[PDB]
Design a protein around this nucleic acid. Structure first.
Ligand SMILES: *CC[C@H](OP(*)(=O)O)[C@H](O)COP(=O)(O)O
Ligand code: NA
Ligand code: NA
Ligand code: NA
Ligand code: NA
Length: 315
DNA sequence: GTCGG
DNA sequence: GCTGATGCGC
DNA sequence: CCGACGGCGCATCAGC
């Protein structure tokens, strides 16, 4: 919008770092720079101005000056026209193809979705499924559809055992109007520090779950589809969490990221440490004590004298 | 790439 | 066969 | 100057 050229430039740079250079820390630096500039409510006039924002340093400032002066970045123009770099970058759009698989494919002349179709022998299961649903997996999921999906999974987990607790988390639980995927956290009173299998099996039985990317005892990653134009196929994760770790898990997997940083910060200065699993009292010498009993995500907040924030208000 | 000890 | 490392997604 | 930057759960690879 105001700085869309800058934010587009930093996201392209991020993708190049992640996918081609395999520099995950440069990827995360450009993304951080991109999101603080996305939030700046003025049209940036100089790199010097942008540098004042946290996450923008000397190099992104220089890049912004080149972009504003010339309307482009020489290096990105060059990366963009590079056949090998552009193809490596592009293949990572397939779920299961990371930077390592995308380079391997481009090294053996496999550059396009069309090339992948004709070399399905050289793809693993995840990559094949990623290829099958390439377009569906880049579609966002309207909230209305997420509610129908939630309807089915809460109905079917209650059918296999009414003692299961299932919470859909992620952007969905923060009231977001569209979602990347569906992340379901499941727990059962029998589980504390075959329960997942029976839920996945029931969801396949009623043809909600259509494919499996990965499954073990505590994490399912797969594909689902709303019953019927056919709805797109969607990514669903299901995490089975110890009941005594559940509400910490729900808080962790709801976010947002910046919200949980600020929540970690507070708990620290109040003599408590929160992670994904437990909240723990902090001794006078900084030694974590025993995990504190947690019965609701409100409990966690109570332990650290914060006022409950509604998932709606946590973005 | 940016931050901070 | 196994154990540990690596790739991957989130 | 230089190390941190999230790290878990699963699939598959590398080595024994
Ligand atoms: C944006 C400029 C780069 O910052 P980073 O340490 O990735 C470098 O200064 C120039 O190197 P290159 O763009 O990676 O060749
Ligand atoms: Na800055
Ligand atoms: Na990918
Ligand atoms: Na690569
Ligand atoms: Na859907």
């Amino acid at each position: 919008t105001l700085n869309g050229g800058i934010t587009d430039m930093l996201t392209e740079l991020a993708n190049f770092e992640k996918n081609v250079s395999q520099a995950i820390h440069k990827y995360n630096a450009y993304r951080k720079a991109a999101s603080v500039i996305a939030k700046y409510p003025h049209k940036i006039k100089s790199g010097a101005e942008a540098k004042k924002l946290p996450g923008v340093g000397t190099k992104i400032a220089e890049k912004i000056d080149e972009f504003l002066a010339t309307g482009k970045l020489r290096k990105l123009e060059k990366i963009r026209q590079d056949d090998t770099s552009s193809s490596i970058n592009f293949l990572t759009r397939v779920s299961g193809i990371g930077p390592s698989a995308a380079r391997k494919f481009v090294d053996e002349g496999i550059k396009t979705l069309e090339d992948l179709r004709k070399n399905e022998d050289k793809l693993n299961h995840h990559q094949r499924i990623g290829l099958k649903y390439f377009g569906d997996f880049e579609k966002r999921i309207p909230r209305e559809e997420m509610l129908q999906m939630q309807d089915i999974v809460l109905n079917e987990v209650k059918k296999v055992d009414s003692e299961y607790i299932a919470t859909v988390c992620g952007s969905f639980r923060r009231g977001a109007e569209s979602s990347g995927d569906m992340d379901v956290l499941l727990t059962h009173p029998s589980f504390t520090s075959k329960l997942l299998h029976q839920v996945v099996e029931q969801l396949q039985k009623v043809h909600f779950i259509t494919d499996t990317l990965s499954k073990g005892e505590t994490k399912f990653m797969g594909v689902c589809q709303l019953p019927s134009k056919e709805y797109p196929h969607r990514r669903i994760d299901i995490r089975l969490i110890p009941k005594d770790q559940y509400y910490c898990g729900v808080l962790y997997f709801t976010g947002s990221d910046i919200f949980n940083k600020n929540m970690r910060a507070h708990a620290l200065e109040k003599g408590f440490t929160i992670n994904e699993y437990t909240i723990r009292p902090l001794g006078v010498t900084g030694v974590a004590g025993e995990p504190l009993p947690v019965d609701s995500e409100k409990d966690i907040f109570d332990y650290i004298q914060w006022k409950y924030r509604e998932p709606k208000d946590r973005s």
